[PDB]
PDB file of C-alpha atoms in Angstrom:
ATOM      1  CA  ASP E  10      60.658 118.215  95.920  1.00 13.22           C
ATOM      2  CA  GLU E  11      63.259 116.539  98.275  1.00 10.12           C
ATOM      3  CA  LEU E  12      63.551 115.896 102.124  1.00  8.63           C
ATOM      4  CA  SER E  13      66.819 115.308 104.143  1.00  8.56           C
ATOM      5  CA  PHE E  14      67.304 112.959 107.155  1.00  9.40           C
ATOM      6  CA  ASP E  15      69.983 112.420 109.741  1.00  6.37           C
ATOM      7  CA  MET E  16      70.299 108.884 111.172  1.00  5.26           C
ATOM      8  CA  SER E  17      71.676 107.841 114.571  1.00  5.31           C
ATOM      9  CA  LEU E  18      73.681 104.602 114.066  1.00  7.30           C
ATOM     10  CA  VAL E  19      74.858 102.142 116.784  1.00  6.86           C
ATOM     11  CA  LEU E  20      77.550  99.543 115.759  1.00  8.55           C
ATOM     12  CA  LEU E  21      77.716  96.587 118.190  1.00 11.15           C
ATOM     13  CA  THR E  22      80.916  94.548 117.902  1.00 13.26           C
ATOM     14  CA  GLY E  23      80.157  92.340 120.941  1.00 13.24           C
ATOM     15  CA  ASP E  24      77.146  91.133 123.025  1.00 11.77           C
ATOM     16  CA  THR E  35      84.545  88.161 126.953  1.00 14.06           C
ATOM     17  CA  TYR E  36      86.960  86.096 124.608  1.00 16.44           C
ATOM     18  CA  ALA E  37      87.458  88.886 121.994  1.00 17.67           C
ATOM     19  CA  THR E  38      90.266  91.331 122.885  1.00 20.11           C
ATOM     20  CA  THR E  39      89.889  95.153 122.849  1.00 21.58           C
ATOM     21  CA  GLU E  40      92.037  95.042 119.660  1.00 18.30           C
ATOM     22  CA  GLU E  41      89.735  92.465 117.990  1.00 16.52           C
ATOM     23  CA  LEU E  42      86.680  94.673 118.858  1.00 17.82           C
ATOM     24  CA  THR E  43      88.328  97.837 117.429  1.00 15.09           C
ATOM     25  CA  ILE E  44      86.923  99.622 114.406  1.00 15.08           C
ATOM     26  CA  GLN E  45      89.428 102.086 112.865  1.00 17.76           C
ATOM     27  CA  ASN E  46      87.243 102.895 109.802  1.00 19.28           C
ATOM     28  CA  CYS E  47      83.966 101.817 108.150  1.00 22.27           C
ATOM     29  CA  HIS E  48      81.784 102.113 105.057  1.00 25.92           C
ATOM     30  CA  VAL E  49      78.064 102.696 105.651  1.00 28.23           C
ATOM     31  CA  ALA E  50      75.605 102.178 102.809  1.00 29.75           C
ATOM     32  CA  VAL E  51      71.832 102.969 102.807  1.00 30.65           C
ATOM     33  CA  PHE E  52      69.520 101.242 100.263  1.00 27.06           C
ATOM     34  CA  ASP E  53      65.869 101.590  99.217  1.00 27.79           C
ATOM     35  CA  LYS E  54      63.334  98.661  99.008  1.00 27.66           C
ATOM     36  CA  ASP E  55      64.554  97.885  95.396  1.00 30.03           C
ATOM     37  CA  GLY E  56      68.250  97.554  96.551  1.00 30.10           C
ATOM     38  CA  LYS E  57      69.384 100.867  95.044  1.00 31.17           C
ATOM     39  CA  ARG E  58      72.032 102.659  97.115  1.00 30.72           C
ATOM     40  CA  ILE E  59      70.657 106.104  98.053  1.00 32.01           C
ATOM     41  CA  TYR E  60      73.467 107.095 100.507  1.00 36.37           C
ATOM     42  CA  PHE E  61      76.991 106.049 101.527  1.00 38.60           C
ATOM     43  CA  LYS E  62      79.703 107.493 103.815  1.00 37.24           C
ATOM     44  CA  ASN E  63      83.221 106.477 104.791  1.00 37.71           C
ATOM     45  CA  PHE E  64      84.077 107.089 108.481  1.00 40.83           C
ATOM     46  CA  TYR E  65      87.557 107.122 110.023  1.00 37.81           C
ATOM     47  CA  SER E  66      88.948 106.975 113.643  1.00 39.78           C
ATOM     48  CA  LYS E  67      88.214 110.721 114.357  1.00 38.52           C
ATOM     49  CA  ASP E  68      84.523 110.187 113.234  1.00 39.07           C
ATOM     50  CA  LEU E  69      83.893 106.815 115.005  1.00 38.20           C
ATOM     51  CA  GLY E  70      84.727 108.395 118.372  1.00 35.31           C
ATOM     52  CA  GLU E  71      85.503 106.221 121.425  1.00 32.02           C
ATOM     53  CA  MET E  72      84.389 102.593 122.059  1.00 34.16           C
ATOM     54  CA  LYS E  73      81.458 102.840 124.520  1.00 32.80           C
ATOM     55  CA  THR E  74      81.038  99.955 126.989  1.00 33.39           C
ATOM     56  CA  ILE E  75      78.147  99.172 129.398  1.00 34.21           C
ATOM     57  CA  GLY E  76      79.216  96.030 131.270  1.00 38.17           C
ATOM     58  CA  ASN E  77      78.878  93.085 128.809  1.00 41.85           C
ATOM     59  CA  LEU E  78      77.933  95.290 125.748  1.00 37.90           C
ATOM     60  CA  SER E  79      80.357  97.303 123.531  1.00 41.16           C
ATOM     61  CA  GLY E  80      80.108  99.554 120.497  1.00 41.45           C
ATOM     62  CA  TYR E  81      80.385 102.788 118.531  1.00 38.48           C
ATOM     63  CA  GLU E  82      77.914 105.598 117.778  1.00 36.72           C
ATOM     64  CA  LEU E  83      77.725 107.287 114.337  1.00 37.24           C
ATOM     65  CA  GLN E  84      75.734 110.012 112.621  1.00 37.24           C
ATOM     66  CA  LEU E  85      74.525 109.730 108.997  1.00 38.78           C
ATOM     67  CA  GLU E  86      73.943 113.360 107.922  1.00 38.74           C
ATOM     68  CA  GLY E  87      71.963 114.281 104.806  1.00 39.19           C
ATOM     69  CA  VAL E  88      70.260 111.051 103.694  1.00 41.92           C
ATOM     70  CA  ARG E  89      68.124 112.293 100.758  1.00 39.13           C
ATOM     71  CA  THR E  90      64.538 111.031 100.174  1.00 40.15           C
ATOM     72  CA  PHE E  91      61.808 112.609  97.964  1.00 37.52           C
ATOM     73  CA  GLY E  92      59.080 113.143 100.646  1.00 38.71           C
ATOM     74  CA  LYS E  93      56.185 110.621 100.650  1.00 36.73           C
ATOM     75  CA  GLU E  94      55.721 109.907 104.425  1.00 34.94           C
ATOM     76  CA  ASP E  95      57.552 106.761 105.817  1.00 34.62           C
ATOM     77  CA  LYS E  96      60.359 105.217 103.690  1.00 37.72           C
ATOM     78  CA  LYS E  97      61.575 101.667 104.621  1.00 40.67           C
ATOM     79  CA  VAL E  98      65.368 101.336 104.058  1.00 43.60           C
ATOM     80  CA  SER E  99      68.287  98.954 104.922  1.00 41.43           C
ATOM     81  CA  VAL E 100      71.749  99.947 106.233  1.00 45.00           C
ATOM     82  CA  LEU E 101      74.918  97.798 105.523  1.00 44.62           C
ATOM     83  CA  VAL E 102      78.183  98.448 107.437  1.00 45.35           C
ATOM     84  CA  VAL E 103      81.650  97.194 106.309  1.00 49.73           C
ATOM     85  CA  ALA E 104      84.244  97.897 109.043  1.00 46.12           C
ATOM     86  CA  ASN E 105      88.107  98.192 108.656  1.00 47.74           C
ATOM     87  CA  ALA E 106      88.181  97.687 104.814  1.00 48.75           C
ATOM     88  CA  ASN E 107      88.494 101.382 103.705  1.00 47.83           C
ATOM     89  CA  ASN E 108      91.509 102.851 101.877  1.00 49.43           C
ATOM     90  CA  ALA E 109      93.247 106.039 103.142  1.00 54.18           C
ATOM     91  CA  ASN E 110      90.529 108.520 101.797  1.00 54.58           C
ATOM     92  CA  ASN E 111      87.835 106.268 100.262  1.00 52.26           C
ATOM     93  CA  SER E 112      86.565 102.654 100.261  1.00 54.18           C
ATOM     94  CA  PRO E 113      86.726  99.832  97.644  1.00 53.10           C
ATOM     95  CA  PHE E 114      82.805  99.851  97.736  1.00 53.63           C
ATOM     96  CA  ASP E 115      82.294 103.487  96.588  1.00 56.44           C
ATOM     97  CA  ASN E 116      81.434 102.516  92.966  1.00 55.60           C
ATOM     98  CA  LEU E 117      78.883  99.794  94.054  1.00 56.73           C
ATOM     99  CA  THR E 118      75.509 101.311  93.052  1.00 56.64           C
ATOM    100  CA  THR E 119      73.229  98.311  94.044  1.00 55.74           C
ATOM    101  CA  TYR E 120      73.129  95.747  96.888  1.00 58.95           C
ATOM    102  CA  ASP E 121      72.344  92.685  94.672  1.00 57.20           C
ATOM    103  CA  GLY E 122      73.100  93.050  90.967  1.00 59.71           C
ATOM    104  CA  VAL E 123      74.924  91.540  87.946  1.00 58.39           C
ATOM    105  CA  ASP E 124      77.594  94.334  87.727  1.00 59.71           C
ATOM    106  CA  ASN E 125      79.041  96.689  90.450  1.00 62.70           C
ATOM    107  CA  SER E 126      77.174  95.101  93.382  1.00 61.02           C
ATOM    108  CA  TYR E 127      78.006  94.451  97.067  1.00 61.45           C
ATOM    109  CA  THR E 128      76.904  90.783  96.744  1.00 58.18           C
ATOM    110  CA  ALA E 129      79.411  90.299  93.847  1.00 54.05           C
ATOM    111  CA  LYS E 130      82.218  92.227  95.714  1.00 54.22           C
ATOM    112  CA  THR E 131      85.303  90.294  96.889  1.00 55.06           C
ATOM    113  CA  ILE E 132      87.952  91.871  99.138  1.00 55.10           C
ATOM    114  CA  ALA E 133      91.492  90.323  98.975  1.00 51.92           C
ATOM    115  CA  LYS E 134      93.018  91.966 102.117  1.00 52.29           C
ATOM    116  CA  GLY E 135      93.549  89.136 104.588  1.00 52.96           C
ATOM    117  CA  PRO E 136      93.050  89.153 108.383  1.00 49.39           C
ATOM    118  CA  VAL E 137      96.525  89.904 109.904  1.00 50.29           C
ATOM    119  CA  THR E 138      96.290  92.860 112.404  1.00 49.47           C
ATOM    120  CA  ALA E 139      93.980  92.263 115.450  1.00 48.80           C
ATOM    121  CA  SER E 140      92.987  95.990 115.544  1.00 48.59           C
ATOM    122  CA  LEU E 141      92.169  96.056 111.747  1.00 48.81           C
ATOM    123  CA  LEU E 142      89.920  92.934 111.408  1.00 49.48           C
ATOM    124  CA  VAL E 143      86.989  93.314 108.989  1.00 48.86           C
ATOM    125  CA  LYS E 144      83.436  93.217 110.475  1.00 46.39           C
ATOM    126  CA  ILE E 145      80.132  93.366 108.535  1.00 46.16           C
ATOM    127  CA  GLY E 146      76.454  93.906 109.511  1.00 45.14           C
ATOM    128  CA  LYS E 147      72.995  94.729 108.054  1.00 44.95           C
ATOM    129  CA  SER E 148      69.780  96.209 109.604  1.00 43.33           C
ATOM    130  CA  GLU E 149      66.324  97.201 108.263  1.00 41.58           C
ATOM    131  CA  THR E 150      64.551 100.409 109.464  1.00 42.77           C
ATOM    132  CA  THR E 151      61.914 103.038 108.447  1.00 42.97           C
ATOM    133  CA  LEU E 152      62.726 106.778 108.066  1.00 40.08           C
ATOM    134  CA  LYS E 153      59.835 108.636 109.820  1.00 38.13           C
ATOM    135  CA  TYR E 154      59.055 111.835 107.780  1.00 38.41           C
ATOM    136  CA  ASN E 155      58.606 115.206 109.677  1.00 36.94           C
ATOM    137  CA  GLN E 156      58.999 113.163 112.941  1.00 34.19           C
ATOM    138  CA  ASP E 157      61.693 112.905 115.681  1.00 33.24           C
ATOM    139  CA  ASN E 158      64.635 110.475 114.930  1.00 32.96           C
ATOM    140  CA  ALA E 159      65.197 107.099 116.745  1.00 33.40           C
ATOM    141  CA  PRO E 160      68.501 105.088 116.993  1.00 34.90           C
ATOM    142  CA  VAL E 161      69.088 102.095 114.665  1.00 35.74           C
ATOM    143  CA  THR E 162      71.496  99.409 115.890  1.00 36.27           C
ATOM    144  CA  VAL E 163      73.673  97.330 113.480  1.00 36.75           C
ATOM    145  CA  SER E 164      75.079  94.060 114.912  1.00 40.28           C
ATOM    146  CA  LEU E 165      78.483  93.440 113.301  1.00 38.68           C
ATOM    147  CA  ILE E 166      80.067  90.014 112.949  1.00 40.55           C
ATOM    148  CA  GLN E 167      83.733  89.128 112.588  1.00 40.80           C
ATOM    149  CA  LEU E 168      84.278  88.191 108.881  1.00 43.99           C
ATOM    150  CA  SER E 169      87.314  86.080 109.886  1.00 46.14           C
ATOM    151  CA  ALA E 170      87.716  83.058 112.152  1.00 45.85           C
ATOM    152  CA  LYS E 171      90.131  83.231 115.147  1.00 49.91           C
ATOM    153  CA  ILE E 172      92.410  80.167 115.621  1.00 50.82           C
ATOM    154  CA  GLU E 173      94.665  79.576 118.680  1.00 51.35           C
ATOM    155  CA  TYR E 174      97.166  76.636 118.664  1.00 54.07           C
ATOM    156  CA  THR E 175      97.561  75.769 122.382  1.00 55.40           C
ATOM    157  CA  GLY E 176     100.244  73.012 122.077  1.00 55.15           C
ATOM    158  CA  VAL E 177     100.625  69.236 122.614  1.00 54.05           C
ATOM    159  CA  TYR E 178      99.673  67.653 125.995  1.00 52.09           C
ATOM    160  CA  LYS E 179     100.126  64.225 127.618  1.00 50.47           C
ATOM    161  CA  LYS E 180      96.797  62.304 127.029  1.00 50.75           C
ATOM    162  CA  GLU E 181      97.272  60.550 130.446  1.00 49.48           C
ATOM    163  CA  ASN E 182      97.456  63.585 132.846  1.00 48.93           C
ATOM    164  CA  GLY E 183      96.802  66.750 130.730  1.00 49.04           C
ATOM    165  CA  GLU E 184     100.355  68.011 131.330  1.00 48.94           C
ATOM    166  CA  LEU E 185     101.779  70.338 128.667  1.00 50.23           C
ATOM    167  CA  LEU E 186     104.877  69.050 126.794  1.00 51.94           C
ATOM    168  CA  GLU E 187     107.858  71.248 125.969  1.00 50.93           C
ATOM    169  CA  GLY E 188     108.652  71.668 122.259  1.00 51.27           C
ATOM    170  CA  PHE E 189     106.048  70.876 119.557  1.00 51.43           C
ATOM    171  CA  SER E 190     106.611  74.369 118.050  1.00 54.37           C
ATOM    172  CA  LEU E 191     104.270  75.646 115.360  1.00 55.60           C
ATOM    173  CA  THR E 192     106.572  76.190 112.356  1.00 56.91           C
ATOM    174  CA  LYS E 193     104.011  76.626 109.504  1.00 56.07           C
ATOM    175  CA  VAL E 194     100.327  77.134 108.757  1.00 57.19           C
ATOM    176  CA  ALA E 195      99.417  76.491 105.141  1.00 55.25           C
ATOM    177  CA  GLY E 196      96.085  77.151 103.405  1.00 56.95           C
ATOM    178  CA  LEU E 197      94.872  80.296 105.250  1.00 56.79           C
ATOM    179  CA  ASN E 198      92.455  82.418 103.129  1.00 60.34           C
ATOM    180  CA  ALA E 199      93.007  86.124 102.290  1.00 60.83           C
ATOM    181  CA  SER E 200      89.861  86.683 100.075  1.00 62.65           C
ATOM    182  CA  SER E 201      86.165  87.038 101.095  1.00 61.73           C
ATOM    183  CA  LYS E 202      82.604  88.034 100.149  1.00 66.06           C
ATOM    184  CA  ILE E 203      81.123  90.901 102.284  1.00 62.89           C
ATOM    185  CA  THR E 204      77.351  90.082 102.296  1.00 62.38           C
ATOM    186  CA  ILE E 205      77.536  86.785 104.298  1.00 61.36           C
ATOM    187  CA  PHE E 206      76.282  86.988 107.902  1.00 60.27           C
ATOM    188  CA  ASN E 207      75.708  83.384 109.207  1.00 57.78           C
ATOM    189  CA  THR E 208      78.125  82.750 112.116  1.00 56.85           C
ATOM    190  CA  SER E 209      76.976  79.041 112.069  1.00 57.27           C
ATOM    191  CA  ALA E 210      77.513  78.043 108.369  1.00 54.58           C
ATOM    192  CA  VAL E 211      80.448  78.480 105.938  1.00 51.12           C
ATOM    193  CA  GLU E 212      79.246  80.821 103.056  1.00 50.29           C
ATOM    194  CA  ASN E 213      82.485  82.402 101.627  1.00 50.92           C
ATOM    195  CA  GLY E 214      83.203  81.106  98.048  1.00 53.41           C
ATOM    196  CA  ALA E 215      86.165  83.538  97.545  1.00 55.32           C
ATOM    197  CA  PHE E 216      89.733  82.213  98.084  1.00 54.05           C
ATOM    198  CA  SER E 217      93.396  83.416  97.776  1.00 54.88           C
ATOM    199  CA  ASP E 218      96.533  82.306  99.702  1.00 52.54           C
ATOM    200  CA  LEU E 219      97.274  84.048 103.074  1.00 52.73           C
ATOM    201  CA  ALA E 220     100.881  83.667 104.149  1.00 51.65           C
ATOM    202  CA  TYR E 221     101.677  82.494 107.653  1.00 50.44           C
ATOM    203  CA  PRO E 222     103.645  85.396 109.256  1.00 48.40           C
ATOM    204  CA  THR E 223     107.450  85.063 109.703  1.00 46.53           C
ATOM    205  CA  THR E 224     106.845  85.805 113.484  1.00 50.93           C
ATOM    206  CA  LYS E 225     105.083  82.322 113.562  1.00 50.36           C
ATOM    207  CA  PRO E 226     102.187  83.432 115.891  1.00 49.89           C
ATOM    208  CA  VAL E 227     100.202  80.985 118.086  1.00 50.41           C
ATOM    209  CA  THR E 228      96.940  83.000 117.498  1.00 50.31           C
ATOM    210  CA  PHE E 229      96.180  83.602 113.794  1.00 50.90           C
ATOM    211  CA  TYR E 230      93.183  84.409 111.461  1.00 51.45           C
ATOM    212  CA  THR E 231      91.591  83.383 108.133  1.00 49.40           C
ATOM    213  CA  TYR E 232      88.475  84.088 106.088  1.00 51.85           C
ATOM    214  CA  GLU E 233      86.002  81.106 105.672  1.00 52.08           C
ATOM    215  CA  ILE E 234      86.764  78.371 103.110  1.00 53.24           C
ATOM    216  CA  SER E 235      83.671  76.714 101.458  1.00 54.47           C
ATOM    217  CA  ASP E 236      85.603  74.066  99.404  1.00 54.13           C
ATOM    218  CA  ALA E 237      85.194  70.726 101.249  1.00 53.62           C
ATOM    219  CA  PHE E 238      88.517  69.538  99.639  1.00 53.46           C
ATOM    220  CA  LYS E 239      90.678  72.424 101.028  1.00 56.25           C
ATOM    221  CA  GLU E 240      92.830  72.035 104.155  1.00 55.67           C
ATOM    222  CA  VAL E 241      94.600  74.180 106.746  1.00 57.70           C
ATOM    223  CA  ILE E 242      97.909  72.307 107.435  1.00 53.70           C
ATOM    224  CA  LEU E 243      99.867  72.765 110.679  1.00 55.14           C
ATOM    225  CA  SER E 244     103.607  71.868 110.678  1.00 53.86           C
ATOM    226  CA  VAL E 245     104.584  71.053 114.287  1.00 58.32           C
ATOM    227  CA  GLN E 246     108.100  69.928 115.488  1.00 61.29           C
ATOM    228  CA  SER E 247     108.232  66.166 116.163  1.00 57.88           C
ATOM    229  CA  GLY E 248     112.042  65.910 116.415  1.00 61.82           C
ATOM    230  CA  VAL E 249     114.456  66.283 113.456  1.00 62.07           C
ATOM    231  CA  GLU E 250     111.809  67.284 110.819  1.00 70.21           C
ATOM    232  CA  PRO E 251     108.396  68.931 111.611  1.00 67.69           C
ATOM    233  CA  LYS E 252     105.414  66.722 110.690  1.00 67.62           C
ATOM    234  CA  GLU E 253     102.330  68.013 108.756  1.00 67.37           C
ATOM    235  CA  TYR E 254      98.851  67.768 110.335  1.00 67.31           C
ATOM    236  CA  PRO E 255      95.756  68.638 108.192  1.00 64.63           C
ATOM    237  CA  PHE E 256      92.407  70.109 109.385  1.00 63.15           C
ATOM    238  CA  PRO E 257      89.177  70.524 107.288  1.00 64.29           C
ATOM    239  CA  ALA E 258      89.276  74.190 106.172  1.00 63.15           C
ATOM    240  CA  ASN E 259      85.423  74.438 106.209  1.00 60.00           C
ATOM    241  CA  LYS E 260      85.352  73.808 110.052  1.00 61.19           C
ATOM    242  CA  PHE E 261      86.535  77.436 110.699  1.00 58.64           C
ATOM    243  CA  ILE E 262      83.428  79.644 110.349  1.00 56.56           C
ATOM    244  CA  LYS E 263      83.529  83.475 110.441  1.00 57.10           C
ATOM    245  CA  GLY E 264      82.750  85.022 113.823  1.00 58.58           C
ATOM    246  CA  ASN E 265      84.040  82.026 115.796  1.00 56.22           C
ATOM    247  CA  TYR E 266      87.098  81.404 118.086  1.00 58.57           C
ATOM    248  CA  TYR E 267      88.850  78.017 117.922  1.00 56.62           C
ATOM    249  CA  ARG E 268      91.590  76.249 119.903  1.00 53.35           C
ATOM    250  CA  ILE E 269      93.792  73.434 118.445  1.00 54.57           C
ATOM    251  CA  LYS E 270      95.110  71.079 121.108  1.00 54.60           C
ATOM    252  CA  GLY E 271      97.020  67.807 120.609  1.00 55.82           C
ATOM    253  CA  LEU E 272      97.158  64.690 122.833  1.00 54.97           C
ATOM    254  CA  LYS E 273     100.455  62.637 122.804  1.00 56.24           C
ATOM    255  CA  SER E 274     100.276  58.961 123.891  1.00 56.67           C
ATOM    256  CA  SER E 275     103.810  57.490 123.078  1.00 56.56           C
ATOM    257  CA  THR E 276     102.194  56.641 119.654  1.00 55.98           C
ATOM    258  CA  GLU E 277     100.647  59.344 117.412  1.00 52.23           C
ATOM    259  CA  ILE E 278      98.888  62.656 118.346  1.00 51.84           C
ATOM    260  CA  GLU E 279      95.069  62.864 118.807  1.00 48.86           C
ATOM    261  CA  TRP E 280      94.058  66.423 117.758  1.00 48.18           C
ATOM    262  CA  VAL E 281      91.131  68.333 119.314  1.00 46.49           C
ATOM    263  CA  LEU E 282      89.321  71.235 117.663  1.00 45.50           C
ATOM    264  CA  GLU E 283      87.398  73.369 120.182  1.00 45.55           C
ATOM    265  CA  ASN E 284      84.739  75.996 119.408  1.00 46.01           C
ATOM    266  CA  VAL E 285      85.344  78.228 122.447  1.00 46.17           C
ATOM    267  CA  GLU E 286      82.127  80.361 122.461  1.00 50.15           C
ATOM    268  CA  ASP E 287      79.894  77.295 121.804  1.00 51.68           C
ATOM    269  CA  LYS E 288      81.834  75.135 124.359  1.00 51.51           C
ATOM    270  CA  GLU E 289      82.096  72.195 121.901  1.00 53.83           C
ATOM    271  CA  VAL E 290      85.010  69.913 120.914  1.00 52.56           C
ATOM    272  CA  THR E 291      85.643  67.783 117.741  1.00 48.58           C
ATOM    273  CA  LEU E 292      88.218  64.957 117.254  1.00 46.91           C
ATOM    274  CA  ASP E 293      88.638  61.725 115.184  1.00 43.61           C
TER     275      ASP E 293
END
């Protein structure tokens, strides 16, 4: 005795600061679990399966079909669906051998990915939703709201404190302390939860907009090396201020003395300085 369901899945990347690249999903891993956290179904989707990015004004996302989710037929069955976007390998995902959501061995909560945020169009997103599979009844769509597992950081230069005029020079030469490792079951876009850490090199193209996974250690720093004449000076920021699913701007204020740095949380419209 066994019944088979097909689920309609909606992946929402955004609900106007994120670029089309940063909203792109090229591949994903979808996992379905029972009430006890046992994985009953999983599927790895790629660009031909994900289809096109649908957009209705302010909203944007992808539609997916989960064919052949097997149950054992006892009316309604409450389940949860977890989506990990842009972390798959060529033909499979690193999560394929994870048989439980929360467990001691081979679990999604224990899983750490070490592939750092570098490409805007291949940024990892994660989401989880709870639903009920209605037996011998017509299907209904289930939406999964995905968050950005990385933080977005834009260095916008050094300005004159007196008039707000942008100064020439003050080139970003180095960013040290960016994180390339992360947990995949953390969804709070307001608190730092990632305990995983490994060094993420600052690209040789020295970009002004760059990414990192969260850093929980209160003693870790993200250090910016900006030109101040002959030798570039180091400027440290608390690594735990950059939370996943947020966009930040680093601005400096020159006053013929030192530089007064400003950390802005763009979506929240908040600023933090000394």
